[PDB]
């Protein structure tokens, strides 16, 4: 029930980075929590030269997003 104007805009700004990312590199699975948490070594079958750099940026964007959300849950009491 976290839907608030800040929660919605942040989720949308993140999904607008994650969704292209998933399509471009055919990320499996598509859920970002399960993907980064499966530390099954994730380089198999990836061939694009921008992947390593983009995956590292994206992990940082996800992690920061997850924190901003945490701070919106705690700002609803």
Swiss-Prot record:
It is found in: Cell membrane. It comes from the Eukaryota. Residues 52-77 form a coiled coil. Probable catalytic subunit of cellulose synthase terminal complexes ('rosettes'), required for beta-1,4-glucan microfibril crystallization, a major mechanism of the cell wall formation. Belongs to the glycosyltransferase 2 family. Plant cellulose synthase subfamily. This is Probable cellulose synthase A catalytic subunit 8 [UDP-forming]. It comes from Oryza sativa subsp. japonica. The chain holds residues 399 to 475 of 1081 of the full protein.
